[model samples]
Target chain A: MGRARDAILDALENLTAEELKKFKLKLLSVPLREGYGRIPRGALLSMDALDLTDKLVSFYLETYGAELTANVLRDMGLQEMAGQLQAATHQ
Target chain B: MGRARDAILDALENLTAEELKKFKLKLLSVPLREGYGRIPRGALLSMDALDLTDKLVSFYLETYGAELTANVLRDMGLQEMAGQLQAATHQ
Candidate 1:
């Protein structure tokens, strides 16, 4: 977990602001769709919010550990992403 | 703001817990890519976190208002979603 967290965060630091902004725009492009329960079609998170969200994610990693993190992402309709993270757990 | 909030919350009331869970899953589908600022790829919100997130959004609606909300989302990389909400402002 420690190694993965460090690796991921270190990877994150490689990003530039414009790139992050572009990444977010791509994030917003995915449609949430209807006939589902209520969810924000998109979110307008602040830079402060982004910072806090990252902190919380790190908190979740250290506290709950990776299995649960993958589980949580899997439960949240992010199976592909979760799969990637889970696969990484082996190395 | 009042109308939108009521409408959205009311829409939420129509959903079952299973549906809400599904919504969370979809919410987690969007990837937070690199060359960008840091953001959580998925959230493992507790029941408390969900409630708090909703409440804070509502507070932003009433206090900071819709424009800020839209701008925030745009800044956070959710432009299309922000556009929808912003368009709704016309009515």
Candidate 2:
């Protein structure tokens, strides 16, 4: 497969300073925790959490079931996060 | 398509607590950079970052190119991380 990072970087580079900054801020809202601390916040922002998060949550739901993960997220009151993740793998 | 999460969840449930913990720790090393903020640390740990990370990096690279994202990570001295991601989508 082609290198995915190349395209991501291009998108970021295409953004104006203000646009990039705003984009990163939006990315900061993604529900990822752990294993990302070392990356610079700007670089992190440049990446897409939507696709990545979908893969992760779907994988987790695969390993743990809806109730154990997604349902829990909903119960814990993060419907928005759970919804996006579920949408990725659910019909 | 089948729900990828179902099989994934089943595998997770089959793990022993120790095994799961170790697995999560390994996942913790994955370099996902964004969109995963509110997920509980344990939940974050429970998910598979390898698959997810690869998708994000690969997509980013696709959009940007090796010299931009992948090469930068290598330059930043994260050869191991870069290698894993490259291995995921590269020959």
Candidate 3:
């Protein structure tokens, strides 16, 4: 097992304030599906909350590694991400 | 920020058979939400088709980096990604 690292937060630390804002736009686009699952499109990201969170963290590490990966999470202010992907193998 | 890379193929070469199987299952799960969006749940990943592809490539670079990231796409046989993310800042 590697470790539980956050992607959103990691990205934030690596990007500049201006870059953060641009990335923020892209982040908003993530949920822009509008009326997706049980809730609004992006809001329903929580409908399969556990599933989504797992992939979220998984994507974080697999995609961004620890630093830039966590940047996105930190920006979302997801500080308590202590349990995002408890099911996925750590490494 | 950097370059466009592939995550799916990258992981394939690196992960064991069992691990690759598990990961493939998860990837399948990405589009398995049932009647998801325009095409279907995961299929809608192409609704904002261009958007999805952009992030796909960007995520590839940012998430997996060049080597490993490129591996996954190769596994997927996405060779033409030569055009996947041409516009993103190439670093």
Candidate 4:
């Protein structure tokens, strides 16, 4: 709901389906909390870019912030987009 | 290191031993990456506040940034400290 969150949504909206899947899988491997389960694969697959972004922001915003989203994009080889995101959100 | 990182170190330095252990245990539960492993218990236990802060900043800054550090503090029931961190570091 903040500018950084919007930037992340925009970045996600620009991703290729393949890239989105990679992002989804990376997030799936990260635990939400000590005993909490990872995001469900079925739910993840059903998400559009906006939905995916919402999920990411909801779960990680307070803790990881926009940086994790940028890092994941960079890891997936979307360096330009990552840079844009970092620029848009840096403190 | 950035000012945010320094702020986190200051927050860590101010923690009681019991508080620091709670922070350490919470961090230990978080994986550094998919397979890179968590920070070792011996290493964690041996650290002073500065060393602990360094480890946290180095590993989480790029991906999670100062926000994760703040959230961890809040999770440990150090809400005032967490608020200070958020105030110091928010974009």
Which candidate tops TM-score?
Answer: 4
- TM-score for each model: 0.29, 0.24, 0.24, 0.45
Give the winner by lDDT: 1 or 3: 1
How high is the lDDT of residue A12 in model 3?
Answer: 37
Residue-wise C-alpha lDDT for candidate 1, range A1-91, written one tens digit per residue: 1445432332333456654454344434433334323213344244322342344344444334345445544554546655666676546
lDDT of 2 by residue, B1-91 (tens): 2223232333344445665456445444545444332323644464453433332322232323232334444554556545654554354
> Candidate 4: where are CA atoms >4 Å away?
A1-91, B31-37
Model no. 4, DockQ: 0.02
Q: Determine which window of 10 residues in candidate 3 chain B has minimal summed lDDT.
A: B31-40
B57 Cα displacement, candidate 2 (Å): 19
CAPRI-style class, candidate 1: incorrect
Model 3 spans > 4 angstroms off:
A1-91, B3-44, B57-69, B77-91
Candidate 3 local Cα displacement, residue A54, angstroms: 30
* Each candidate's fnat: 0.00, 0.00, 0.00, 0.00
- Candidate 4, residue A86: Cα displacement in angstroms equals 16
RMSD of each candidate relative to the true structure:
17.0, 18.7, 15.7, 13.7
Every candidate's TM-score, chain A alone = 0.39, 0.34, 0.30, 0.77
